[PDB]
Amino acid sequence: ANRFTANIKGLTQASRNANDGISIAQTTEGALNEINNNLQRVRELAVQS
Amino acid sequence: ANRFTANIKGLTQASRNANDGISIAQTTEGALNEINNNLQRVRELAVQS
């Protein structure tokens, strides 16, 4: 029972760890989207030029 | 999707460029019409001379 308690604790915390990982991935994607939009506008300008 | 979008924007701007090209070409041709006519008149005048 003691060992099971230990494992339950560990995996329980690991769940929220992975959650935070998801969060950081989300934020990085959010920034990259706007970066892409800016670059596409730049390509518009380039073809114009 | 990103490449398709970039291509679409480029092609639209290129369409505008083509419109500019036709405009300039037809402007020059319009002027050339009167120029040629004037040379024809000069030919008539010299032949009369």
Automatic annotation (TrEMBL), chains A, B:
Regions that span the bilayer: none
Domain of life: Bacteria
Subcellular location: Secreted; Bacterial flagellum
Family: Belongs to the bacterial flagellin family.
Free-text function comment from the UniProt entry: Flagellin is the subunit protein which polymerizes to form the filaments of bacterial flagella.
Official protein name in the record: Flagellin
Native source organism of the sequence: Salmonella enterica (Salmonella choleraesuis)
Lineage: Bacteria, Pseudomonadati, Pseudomonadota, Gammaproteobacteria, Enterobacterales
Shown segment, full-protein numbering: 51 to 99 of 495
